[PDB]
UniProtKB/Swiss-Prot annotation:
Residues 20-110 form the Fibronectin type-III domain. Receptor for netrin required for axon guidance. Mediates axon attraction of neuronal growth cones in the developing nervous system upon ligand binding. Its association with UNC5 proteins may trigger signaling for axon repulsion. It also acts as a dependence receptor required for apoptosis induction when not associated with netrin ligand. Implicated as a tumor suppressor gene. It is found in: Membrane. It comes from Homo sapiens. Changing V46M: In MRMV1; uncertain significance. It comes from the Eukaryota. Found in axons of the central and peripheral nervous system and in differentiated cell types of the intestine. Not expressed in colorectal tumor cells that lost their capacity to differentiate into mucus producing cells. Interacts with the cytoplasmic part of UNC5A, UNC5B, UNC5C and probably UNC5D. Interacts with DSCAM. Interacts with PTK2/FAK1 and MAPK1. Interacts with NTN1. Interacts with MYO10. Interacts with CBLN4; this interaction can be competed by NTN1. Interacts with SIAH1 and SIAH2. It is linked to Mirror movements 1: A disorder characterized by contralateral involuntary movements that mirror voluntary ones. While mirror movements are occasionally found in young children, persistence beyond the age of 10 is abnormal. Mirror movements occur more commonly in the upper extremities. Some MRMV1 patients have agenesis of the corpus callosum. Changing M35L: In MRMV1; uncertain significance. Belongs to the immunoglobulin superfamily. DCC family. Inactivation of DCC due to allelic deletion and/or point mutations is related to lymphatic and hematogenous metastatic tumor dissemination. Ubiquitinated; mediated by SIAH1 or SIAH2 and leading to its subsequent proteasomal degradation. This is Netrin receptor DCC.
Length: 116
């Protein structure tokens, strides 16, 4: 946020859902995948958290609702050499807002980054 926003909804807009994170970085690891997003360009909006929807081929394989404080989530217990679609979206008393999609293909344990 800004100016250390500590406290309940004072001069924000909860009636409306939180917009997507200005940006969502995701790094597909061997058996894990770390992701770091940011708050809505509009600090005047209420944010109860974010819905982390990741999954192999489809971001609807595993969902994880975190707090509005979590700026990043490390997805572990994943496979290697597979596409992992990550979809992060902000949620609040109003519900869910413009969901943000992403892509992250895990790594490969066995040596060999590419054929060529």
């Amino acid at each position: 946020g800004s100016s250390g926003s500590s406290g309940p909804e004072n001069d924000l807009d909860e009636s409306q859902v939180p917009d997507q994170p200005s940006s969502l970085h995701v790094r597909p690891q061997t058996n894990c995948i770390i992701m770091s997003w940011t708050p809505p360009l509009n600090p005047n909006i209420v944010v109860r958290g974010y819905i982390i929807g990741y999954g192999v081929g489809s971001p609807y394989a595993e969902t994880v609702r975190v707090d509005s404080k979590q700026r990043y989530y490390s997805i572990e217990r994943l496979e290697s050499s597979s596409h992992y679609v990550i979809s992060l979206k902000a949620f609040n008393n109003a519900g869910e807002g413009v969901p943000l999609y992403e892509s992250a293909t895990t790594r490969s344990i066995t040596s060999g980054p590419s054929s060529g």
